[PDB]
Design an enzyme around this catalytic site. Sequence first.
Site, mmCIF file in Angstrom:
data_model
loop_
_atom_site.group_PDB
_atom_site.id
_atom_site.type_symbol
_atom_site.label_atom_id
_atom_site.label_comp_id
_atom_site.label_asym_id
_atom_site.label_seq_id
_atom_site.Cartn_x
_atom_site.Cartn_y
_atom_site.Cartn_z
ATOM 1 N N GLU A 80 0.818 -1.204 0.000
ATOM 2 C CA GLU A 80 0.000 0.000 0.000
ATOM 3 C C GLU A 80 0.860 1.265 0.000
ATOM 4 O OE1 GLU A 80 -3.556 0.257 -0.205
ATOM 5 O OE2 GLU A 80 -2.744 2.227 -0.722
ATOM 6 N N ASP A 108 -2.301 -4.973 1.023
ATOM 7 C CA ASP A 108 -1.800 -3.850 1.779
ATOM 8 C C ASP A 108 -0.330 -4.229 2.139
ATOM 9 O OD1 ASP A 108 -4.028 -2.203 1.331
ATOM 10 O OD2 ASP A 108 -5.301 -2.996 2.940
HETATM 11 MN MN MN Z 1 -7.193 -1.951 2.680
#
Ligand code: MN
Length: 196
Positions: A80, A108
């Site tokens: 992320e 992420d």
């Molecule tokens: Mn997320």
Amino acid sequence: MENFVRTNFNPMILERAEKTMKEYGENPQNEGNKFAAISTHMEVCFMYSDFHFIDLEGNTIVKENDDDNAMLKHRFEIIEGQERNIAWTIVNSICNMTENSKPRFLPDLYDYKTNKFIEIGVTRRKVEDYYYEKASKLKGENVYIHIFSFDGEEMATDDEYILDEESRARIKTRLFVLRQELATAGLWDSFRQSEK
Ligand SMILES: [Mn+2]
């Protein structure tokens, strides 16, 4: 809201959040709430990852100094907040060196210790609802799922937590602080509702 966000998050996070936002046409201006959500989600990712390393003995360890350096590997690959080009390069590369299958959605995080991909969610709603919304959208492709909320509740896949309790604490507090700040700034309600 934008002033609130720009006041309450560090510049690195703001940079990344604005960035990822300038890709769906939306801008902190007419989309304060999305800007907030992204900022939060991002910060949580960093909190999850920072100060976490792997030993030369392969154990996981938390260290205050944070700098990497040849006896210490970072525990996580922060996916992320990278450019999609770089993110996918990282994901693809990892799936190459392993028997992980390339996921449909960008995760992420990636954990080098457990070799799992990690989705992170933060919610203003329950925690069960979000979890089952995510779990079911992510079915099959075994990605470990960790949900936080602003009422300090929390919910992971099968209820094991690969993150140390202290760091999970730290997170749950932060979200709490933020919730208070929003409330005292009169922004909490609009925000809580804007979800989905
Ligand atoms: Mn997320």
